[PDB]
Amino acid sequence: AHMKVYLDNNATTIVDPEVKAAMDPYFTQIYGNPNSLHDFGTECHPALRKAMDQMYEAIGARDEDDIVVTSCATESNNWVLKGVYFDLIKNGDKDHIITTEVEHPSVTATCRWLEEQGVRVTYLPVNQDGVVEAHTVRDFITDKTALVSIMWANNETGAIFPVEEISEICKEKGVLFHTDGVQAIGKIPVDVIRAGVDFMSFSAHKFHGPKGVGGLYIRNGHPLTSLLHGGEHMGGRRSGTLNVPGIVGMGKAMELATYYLKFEEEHVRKLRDKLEDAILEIPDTYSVGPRENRTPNTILVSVRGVEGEAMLWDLNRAGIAASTGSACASEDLEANPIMVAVGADSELAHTAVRLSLSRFTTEEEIDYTIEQFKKAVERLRSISSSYA
Amino acid sequence: HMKVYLDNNATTIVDPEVKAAMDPYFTQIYGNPNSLHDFGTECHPALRKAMDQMYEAIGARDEDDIVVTSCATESNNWVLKGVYFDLIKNGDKDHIITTEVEHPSVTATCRWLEEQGVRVTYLPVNQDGVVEAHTVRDFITDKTALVSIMWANNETGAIFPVEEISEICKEKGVLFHTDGVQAIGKIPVDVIRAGVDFMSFSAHKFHGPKGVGGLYIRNGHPLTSLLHGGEHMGGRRSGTLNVPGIVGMGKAMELATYYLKFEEEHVRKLRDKLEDAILEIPDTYSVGPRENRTPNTILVSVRGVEGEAMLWDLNRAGIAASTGSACASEDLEANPIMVAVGADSELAHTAVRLSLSRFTTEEEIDYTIEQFKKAVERLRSISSSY
């Protein structure tokens, strides 16, 4: 019983061979610095131009808007948070930031440090459906709220946040809106104008691009104090020599993601649903989050008798790669036991198994995963005296 | 006609061995190193070997820290803004010492810190194109938080007396940061012998890939993170690891120290040949002393001709070079010389910078000499007083 199957795609994804082939020339064949004037440096300019065009088209940004290439979505989140702190809080009349308990550590830890800098932060807890609603954030915005930072889709549950309604509420109060959209690219339609966001973070290696390159979308070239100062790279907004292969591969990967989105909604969703229905056939199993508001590739299943980490280890011993997710117990409206999303720092949190597919997952992999999941659940429930 | 790359101080070609070492970690080995499953851990031995190569190449110790950044610009921003946050915003300091010839990642960061109330003295540079240790010793106060001086200059190739400055800085109990991007692969780098507390470096300057850099920290000295989040790099710099970048950076750093220990004579002889041949042209001046210059750099000022026009005419001939700011002066014998100067000076004129690498051939140098002579004669016939 061993077959290597990758179902941890929400953590990182395989680089599409087409993306790697598009990147290949820009290490040894085309290596000049793009900021130089000689032909060696300018040779890569059309590739960067095409890649930036691909990025603009893939998220539906406009020409007035800016897309600054960062090294990772962590850089983009740190940049947005610390820049709005510097612009509107340290050198402004604001002191409040609204966010969620389910953000990536690049957002939460940055907010904790900003709290160490005197910034007021309300970490909005998440509802039963695993999302934050727009009327709640509307209730929490004051005349000193500087920024609302809410992820587009959650990386543990795959639940999609109502980004457009939150944007409407933010526009009424005249407060900036940043979204961590890493989990959106390649899994849900991304239109940064319909979403009404002022800032968007994204990371290439979550949609089959290379590691080490990310991006930040800014609406209308909105002023934001640079996190990296120096030369006039990226319009003087982020200095440092351009990651030419990273940019080329990121553009190619984003184009491929927008093309494969319909594959991901039809076939990948069929495979995710197959795996999830088969897993839910096991007694005392609960899928976290409603599927009708979930990204098509994510499952977060809580097993009642088994512990999550032992389940992950037993799966990896069978060659299946998965991850963890925080969940807590609750009831529905019919008073039925369900598992709901919760912040990892809660004391009511237990670890559930997260299985995340990609456009490369096969039905053979899904059948094998079903069989091994049943085997491991049976095995770990067979060794306990407390399970009934 | 021959295309020739002599702009290695700006960026370098990825060594085919480095790219081959990187190749598996895009599609064959793609797991996240922070994951617990076998897919993520598959790349762990490669990361371990790469970090060991990085530690060995600069002579860091096991107590020391080497944090992988995205670029040397990130490392400089991190060091400057972090020491500002630790010892200035929440401390009793307000002074930072640097030079007028630092990289923009240092100069613009210091200008922003000046916009934050920090006193900065951009130390002027001497005739030899360097800053001496007694000057900074004279400029340290009891509120100076950090001294940031580049290890070697990217326009002139002049090497800074990092060890003497480190001694004087230790006497005053002030931290020492160096931008060592121009040091790796061209001069011996021992961060314990150099006495530095922080070092920035960038892989694509010693034949590594673009998009990956590093910051050296002495004895794990506390330094507030520029990128917060998860506990990547020991909790000092969050963000998913650039696995191919790290592997290739380690390979490139090992290869750089190897070609420094043996193949330094070849690159230095080619630089000497090119410089002697160019200086055979009347009224040409090589900026900076050769005996204090990196083995790969020449910065030549041509009289009557402008540096940018010379660069352009060279590029039409397929030769890639860059510019460097220099100003006119005299030596002690009152002889005409061109000396290093900040780019923002009003007495600065642009000289041509030619920087070789371990991949430069002597045929390239012969072609470059011929075309340089041709271009000098061609542009002097149409320009200024010649």
Number of domains in chain B: 2
Residues B75 and B103 in one domain: yes
Query: Of all helices (H) and strands (E), which one includes residue A39?
Result: helix A39-42
By CA distance, what is A320's nearest residue in B? Answer: B37
Nearest Cβ partner of A20 from B5, B10, B26?
B26
Buried b (16+ CB within 10 A) or exposed e, A23-57: bbbbbeebbbbbebbbebbbbbeebbebbbebbbe
The resolution in angstroms reads 3.2
* Residue B327 annotated to the active site: yes
Q: Are B37 and A8 in contact (CB under 8 A)?
A: yes
Contact A15/B at CB under 8 A: yes
Residues B32 and B67 in one domain: yes
Look at residue A116 and tell me if it is in a domain: yes
Buried b (16+ CB within 10 A) or exposed e, A227-259: bbbbbebbeebbbbbbbbbbbbbbbbbbbbbbe
Residues A156 and A292 in one domain: no
Residues B328 and B213 in one domain: no
CB contact (8 A) between residue A241 and residue B14 = no
First-last CA distance in chain B? 27
Q: Which of A212, A227, A260 is the last residue of a domain?
A: A260
Residues B232 and B305 in one domain: no
Look at residue B380 and tell me if it is in a domain: no
Interface A-B: count of C-beta contacts within 8 A = 215
Taking the C-alpha atoms of residue B222 and residue B235, their distance in angstroms, rounded to an integer, is 12
Q: Are A239 and A228 in contact (CB under 8 A)?
A: yes
Phi, psi of B302, rounded to the nearest 5 degrees: -105, 135
Query: Which of chain A's residues have a Cβ under 8 Å away from the Cβ of B15?
Result: 28
Residues B163 and B294 in one domain: no
In DSSP terms, B69 is beta-bridged to B213
Distance of CA A82 to the CA centre of its chain: 20
Contact A116/B at CB under 8 A: no
In DSSP terms, B200 is beta-bridged to B179, B215
Q: How many CB atoms lie within 10 A of CB B192?
A: 13
Q: Which of A223, A240, A260 is the last residue of a domain?
A: A260
Contact A31/B at CB under 8 A: yes
SS3 content of chain A, % helix, strand, coil (to 5): 40, 20, 40
| The pair of three-digit structure tokens given for residue B87, joined into one six-digit string | 């010892």
Look at residue B383 and tell me if it is in a domain: no
Q: What is the DSSP letter of B160?
A: P
Look at residue B162 and tell me if it is in a domain: yes
Virtual CA dihedral for A80, A82, A86, A90, nearest 10 degrees? 130
Residues A102 and A239 in one domain: yes
Residues B144 and B199 in one domain: yes
Q: Are B308 and A28 in contact (CB under 8 A)?
A: no
Q: For the domain that residue A183 is a member of, what is the CATH number?
A: 3.40.640.10
Distance of CA A266 to the CA centre of its chain: 21
Look at residue B384 and tell me if it is in a domain: no
| The pair of three-digit structure tokens given for residue B213, joined into one six-digit string | 């850099």
Q: Which residue stretches of A240-307 are H helix?
A: 244-263, 269-280
Question: Could you tell me which residues come within 8 angstroms of residue A290 by beta carbon, excluding any fewer than 6 positions away?
Answer: A129, A130, A159
Owner of token pair 């101080």? B9
Q: For the domain that residue B294 is a member of, what is the CATH number?
A: 3.90.1150.10
Residues A176 and A76 in one domain: yes
Taking the C-alpha atoms of residue B96 and residue B87, their distance in angstroms, rounded to an integer, is 11
Residues A106 and A243 in one domain: yes
Q: How many CB atoms lie within 10 A of CB B116?
A: 14
CB contact (8 A) between residue B104 and residue A78 = no
Look at residue A184 and tell me if it is in a domain: yes
Q: Which of A260, A294, A310 is the last residue of a domain?
A: A260
Residues B224 and B293 in one domain: no
| The pair of three-digit structure tokens given for residue B235, joined into one six-digit string | 């909790």
CB contact (8 A) between residue A230 and residue B73 = yes
Domain of residue A214 covers 16-260
Taking the C-alpha atoms of residue B150 and residue B153, their distance in angstroms, rounded to an integer, is 7
Look at residue A113 and tell me if it is in a domain: yes
How deeply is A69 buried, as exposed, middle or buried, from its count of CB atoms within 10 A (0-12, 13-18, 19+)? buried
CB contact (8 A) between residue A72 and residue B70 = yes
Query: Of all helices (H) and strands (E), which one includes residue A330?
Result: strand A323-331
Residues A98 and A165 in one domain: yes
Look at residue A382 and tell me if it is in a domain: no
